[PDB]
């Protein structure tokens, strides 16, 4: 009953003692299965999960700079040297300034200097890498076996979890007395991860192509790097500027955190649950057999008591109606008589069920249950029960 | 914020209703309607879901409904066990959770008995020190009553109803003062009807 | 089985903070949102928030907003309640509570049977108060009732007795309350004959042991 | 002797018995004066200084999100409401969420959901405004007064201070002994601050267009807005992203420090001093009158000990020679006799002097001085002093 | 006239912080960087650091990057040299001196006649040892010199005499050192003739006062 | 950093020299060569700026020079007010400044006179208590001598010298042991003349 109430809500219907049916599960959408003398299903794909990431590469956007330092020479004395020069964490660059006796040199003219800053991140991202073996798909299946919305549970067996993986892309779930129903999927139907990575900013996260990835002009340290990080092109946010042949000085870019978000405006957005990564798009091809899927209540025998509705029936986006209905009764497990009818004496059916085989299960008094109906365009009559005491909701679609 | 009565009671066998009041916000626009059993010493118990479904062991003696802004809760066929606290609660728009004041439930083991009020003034050796008016509400049945301290009153403190020993209820509420504050110059409702007891320091 | 056991009960003073426990067996811990409701002493039930078990988010009452944090650890299964800047209002039994969050980990709407289970309760008081002994005065009758006030004493319980133990019948000792100045008071009171006002002597031996004092104070009749 | 040493040094001569002189003085560079009959004058602008700045604008780079609330209403009940869209520090956006029985609805289909959140700064730039009255210029001026190279000071004659603002762009120096120089200058030539302003962001200063600085689009508040700022236009870092009719959430954009510091690569860059503005760029042209300027020692007798050279005479970048002498004599004061000659017999004056009257002053024994020459192209002899005792340096220029 | 007057004399425990100032009086102290030059005592001088006092810039030295604060306060004219984790090491007189500025107002290259004037300097002692009383052993002679050695005492100065002020000629006590055990030791020497070993006795009168202790030791010549 | 003699003297009326001797980073790259004299108790004064220069006020008799990586002050016609300490000084190319080692100036009131050296071991009194070797120095002059203590050691303590009553320098240095330590098993050297002195705990 899951997809009541979804908006993305696709209906397939599959041949009547059909073996398989095939079926396409996308994220936010629900497919609701209907066959004859089969019970109505629901299923879903929930999640997709990869897991197992391996860390590829970490860029600073955003970078500070500290302990500045300075060398200098006077004219024809050679070339200035500081020692954090042999200091990795150091950028330096050299110049030439004025010189002369008013500065302590003996000769007048371009004298060499040499100025160290020590670079150190403040903010960066990290890309880790996607291996197309490790991604898992979890498919959610709930039966239409005339539970009432609302349905608290104290192993259901209406609802049913199944779990895909490239490696094995086949799964069957058992439903109790509804038997099991088997899945083989299409995993490798998708985007290719041959060239994707997962890369993380700031706690929001992306799916980005690699080569745009590599190509980014920002410094970067290894994934292997860990501690404290060794960050290769860090000119990418540090630059020197001369003044007048007297100063250099340098400054850092500040943070490139909006153009990158700029950037990735174009890109699939992702989220993360602890050390694993979820995504919300993709898709995924079922075939799924149902030779082994049976109807639970078929064999019982017909309820003989008064329902009454304990909500309005609500007409679902799709056009179709939900009824949820209490039984005074303790005949239970009975076969819920429920049709719709544009004429109350022939009593003639007319559109369809969607939930097949609806029935109350409890033997105690005062139980409810949930079914869904398909009406025919225009006007019908919504009756439930047989006889006398029969309940009617007269119900216009369109 | 949810405002449903402070006490209800019935004989066994009677139905009895619970109304819980509250706003469009909450009650009036939302299913999240739900009532809670809760006996005395004992964690809350969910009763009511959604406002007619019940949750698997609850006895259908127990029913729901809901007409605009206000929910109802029905209990048929009165047992002494269904004795107890009862507290309506809803989601609300805003995306948090509201409880009702609590109704107590009695089922009347014993007639209804109106109390017996004695109001006492501060005694001398009291007021030998700086600083009370104390009110005793004995023999009360059910254990549910309201008291108001010329004119209306305010900060003051009751106490909750509590079982005497011969199974009636008894409560005591005190008005603390000092001296001068006494010398600038109670009544239990119960059942509907209130009866009233006076004091004066000027009086003998 | 589902239970939720809850930490032991908490004495601290105003302006301290409180951390309470809930501990949640028999379910499947990280497919719930654990909530915290409290209530004081004969008053209603007040939601004050809740935690996704799952991923950690948070969602707090506008009235707690500040002081409240709602935090977890998975691997213990536990849900936690950290109250800070306390004052005497928030005495009271502290529960927890689940609900079920979606089959996607988001915990949006909740479902229409939330608050399905139910810890046990922690209490937890907070009075600025030291151990300190009740003081104890008379009452007067002017069918007809007599009494004796005990007030300010720290820390509950008090016992009392009339008599020595000899007057039984017809005594009620009432639960004693707590004032805004944070100290507990209550009053015990007996019914007896109008002959015997000036025949029988009323002796109330009240001793408060947590405090270390035994106060006996008659009551007299005397006079308006 | 300030501009001995500056490599971006200009010679300008002057009319003998002339009365005003035009210069053209710029940031960086330093101008030596001289004419016949006239001490040699070394002039240089120093410093330009914006007082009294008006703030004009605060534009938020950097945005952090807070207290996120909501309020959702069923089909047909209306639209939602939340009280914080009447907070002005809150940014609130409305859509539409599938409802129906599942999570507390009646009816089936959409229903209304508005959103909420507290919007707070991290990071801003500030826009201040320029009067064109207020700037100040700072000029400095040395005279050739025979001073040795390490002038210590224990009001010096050699040195004066002037400042010249819009209001009052004239000024007279007073240089003891050699009287007073007059500067009329221009202010009103240069770069227009109708349209300028200046922007600082991070402890980093640049003068922007008044258009382009209107045109950001950023969040901003009024110049006036003190204390607790109340933000405009925060949807320019503030967006809400719908995620499958079932949730939409908000998402602040990155710094955007790094985007301004692209769009003013082109831009003129500042400083501040306390709450003085600093600017490190711009000229000024001045007309300098020097009928009162008069050449102090002009008078004194020659001096007959002999000198010493106490350093190596040095070629500055233009070509220029420094020399510098200690005298043993105590006839001081005293002209230094000082020439440059290719014949060792005639002593016939080749080339000419810089620093003119070149002098000793103390009459101390062991008194150093410094002058300055300027020899003719190709081989020529330093030659100070007379008679026996005179000492010579052969000096080669290309 | 140029005068640069320091703070008083300070005595603080290792791991403490120092903060000592420099008031700049005769001059325009805008235009002025000033260093921090210190000098241990009997040892040279070692440069410490400058700040720009116009626009607040400093320049440490690599030795003592980390521990080391140099600050302003411009409407005081002062200059201020905070050092923190302080060592035994650290004991010595600190000395301000000047340096001028540019007339940009940058402090790049000083200038050739940099350190024109100088601060009359702070005695900073830093030691972790409390006030304790010496203690005193005596010496041997085998024209014959003997003495008496007072060591860990704490704090300066010790007083000696010998025999009660009768011999006076040819004594002298010398200065204090300061080992690393943070306490001083100084011995007092006297030379007497050979010919009166075994006949005039030799006491030695140390007090010190600050200490509270007041020790006389006699010197016999024995044997080795 | 920067060496310079530790002590040189002169009789009054002649002149001296000294010596300071960097690197090509500070004496031998730059001209911000100062020379400083400090008498006792007294800030530094700036005899000499700028290897030649001389600030106002300060007597001709004092003349700069320099070669290489060496720098020299000469001092002629010495006056008994030029006794003092005098420092040399350096800018260096890492923006820095480096001091040398200071050299005590004598000019001779006194002829040179060897000191008299005497070394005293522990007494018993010390040896009945868990931890001396002391070594004392008198009657020299110039007060400017260097102390060593069957091979070299370190790790000790020595005074700098110190006026006599007599106007004779003094000093002294102190070994600190154990008990055990001392049984395991001092030379001055002044004016280029080193005079030593034995003692032994297991010679008498």
């Known amino acids: 009953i899951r997809c009541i109430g979804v908006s993305n809500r696709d209906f397939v219907e599959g041949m009547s003692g059909g073996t398989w049916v095939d079926v396409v599960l996308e994220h936010g959408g629900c497919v ?134 490239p490696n094995s892309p086949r799964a069957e779930a058992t439903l109790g007395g509804f038997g099991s ?24 996260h992306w799916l980005v192509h690699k080569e745009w990835f590599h190509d980014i002009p920002l410094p970067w340290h290894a994934g292997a790097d860990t501690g404290t990080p060794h960050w290769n092109n860090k000119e990418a946010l540090v630059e020197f500027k ?88 303790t005949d239970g497990p009975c076969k819920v008589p429920a049709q719709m009818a544009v004429d109350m004496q022939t009593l003639t059916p007319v559109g369809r069920l969607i939930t097949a085989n609806p029935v109350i299960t409890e033997s105690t008094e005062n139980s409810k249950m949930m079914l869904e109906l398909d009406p025919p365009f225009g006007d019908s009559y919504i009756v439930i029960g047989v006889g006398e005491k029969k309940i009617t909701h007269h119900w216009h679609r369109s | 914020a949810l405002t449903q009565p402070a006490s209800v009671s019935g004989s066994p066998g009677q139905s009895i209703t619970i109304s819980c009041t509250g706003t469009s916000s909450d009650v009036g626009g939302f299913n999240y309607v ?122 003051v403190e009751t106490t909750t109803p509590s079982k005497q020993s011969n199974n009636k209820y008894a409560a005591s509420s005190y008005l603390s003062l000092t001296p001068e504050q006494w010398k600038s110059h109670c009544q239990v409702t119960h059942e509907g009807s209130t009866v009233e007891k006076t004091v004066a320091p000027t009086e003998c | 089985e589902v239970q939720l056991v809850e930490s032991g009960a908490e004495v601290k003073k105003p302006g301290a903070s409180v951390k309470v426990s809930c501990k ?99 209490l937890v008081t907070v009075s600025s108060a030291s151990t300190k002994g009740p003081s104890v005065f008379p009452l007067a009758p002017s069918t007809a009732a007599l009494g004796c006030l005990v007030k300010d004493y720290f820390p509950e319980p008090v016992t009392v007795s009339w008599n020595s133990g000899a007057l039984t019948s017809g005594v009620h000792t009432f639960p004693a309350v707590l004032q805004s100045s944070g100290l507990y008071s209550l009053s015990s009171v007996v019914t007896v004959p109008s002959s015997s006002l000036g025949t029988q002597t009323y002796i109330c031996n009240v001793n408060h042991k947590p405090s270390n004092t035994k106060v006996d104070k008659r009551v007299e009749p005397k006079s308006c």
Chains 1, 4 share one sequence.
């Open chain 1, 181 to 204: 129903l088997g899945l083989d999927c299409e995993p490798r139907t998708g985007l290719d991860f041959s060239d994707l990575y997962y890369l993380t900013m700031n706690n929001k």
């Open chain 2, 34 to 155: 739900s009532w809670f059993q809760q006996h005395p010493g004992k964690a809350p118990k969910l009763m009511l879901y959604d406002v007619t479904s019940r949750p698997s062991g609850v006895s259908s003696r127990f029913s729901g409904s809901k007409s605009g802004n206000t929910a109802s809760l029905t209990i048929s066929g009165l047992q002494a066990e269904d004795e107890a606290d009862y507290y309506c609660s809803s989601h609300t728009s805003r995306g948090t959770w509201v409880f009702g004041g609590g109704t107590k439930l009695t089922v009347l083991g014993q007639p209804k008995a109106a109390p017996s009020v004695t109001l006492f003034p501060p005694s001398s050796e009291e007021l030998q020190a700086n600083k009370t008016l104390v009110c005793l509400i004995s023999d009360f049945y059910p254990g549910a009553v309201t008291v108001a301290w010329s004119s209306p009153v305010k900060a």
């Open chain 1, 242 to 329: 001369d003044a007048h042949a007297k100063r250099q000085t340098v400054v850092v870019l500040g943070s490139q955190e909006g153009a990158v978000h700029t950037a990735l405006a174009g890109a699939l957005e992702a989220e993360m649950d602890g050390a694993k990564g979820r995504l919300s798009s993709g898709h995924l091809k079922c075939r799924l057999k149902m030779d082994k899927l049976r109807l639970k209540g078929v064999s019982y025998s017909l309820c003989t008591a008064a329902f009454t509705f304990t909500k309005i029936p609500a007409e679902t986006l799709h056009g179709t109606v939900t009824v949820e209905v209490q039984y005074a009764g």
């Open chain 3, 24 to 122: 949640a067996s028999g379910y499947t811990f990280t497919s719930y949102a654990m909530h915290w409701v409290r209530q004081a002493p004969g008053q209603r039930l007040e939601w004050m928030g809740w935690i996704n078990a799952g991923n950690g988010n948070t969602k707090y009452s506008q009235k707690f907003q500040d002081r409240v944090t709602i935090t977890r650890d998975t691997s213990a299964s536990t849900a936690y309640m950290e109250l800070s800047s306390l004052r005497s209002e928030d005495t009271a039994i502290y529960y927890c509570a689940r609900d079920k969050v979606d089959d996607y980990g988001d915990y949006w709407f909740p479902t229409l049977w939330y608050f399905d289970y139910w810890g046990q309760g922690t």
């Open chain 1, 32 to 165: 609701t299965v209907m066959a004859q003398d089969k019970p109505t299903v629901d299923i879903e794909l929930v999640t997709t999960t990869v897991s197992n990431m391996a860390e590829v590469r970490s860029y600073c956007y955003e970078a500070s700079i500290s302990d500045m330092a300075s060398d200098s020479r006077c004219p024809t004395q050679g070339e200035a040297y500081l020692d954090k020069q042999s200091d990795t964490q150091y950028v330096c660059k050299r110049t030439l300034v004025d010189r002369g006796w008013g500065n302590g040199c003996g000769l007048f003219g371009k004298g060499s200097l040499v100025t160290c800053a020590k670079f150190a991140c403040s903010k960066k991202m990290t890309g880790k890498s996607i291996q197309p073996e490790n991604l898992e798909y979890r498919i959610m299946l709930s039966v239409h076996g005339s539970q009432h919305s609302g349905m608290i549970v104290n192993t259901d067996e209406n609802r049913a979890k199944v779990e895909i993986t």
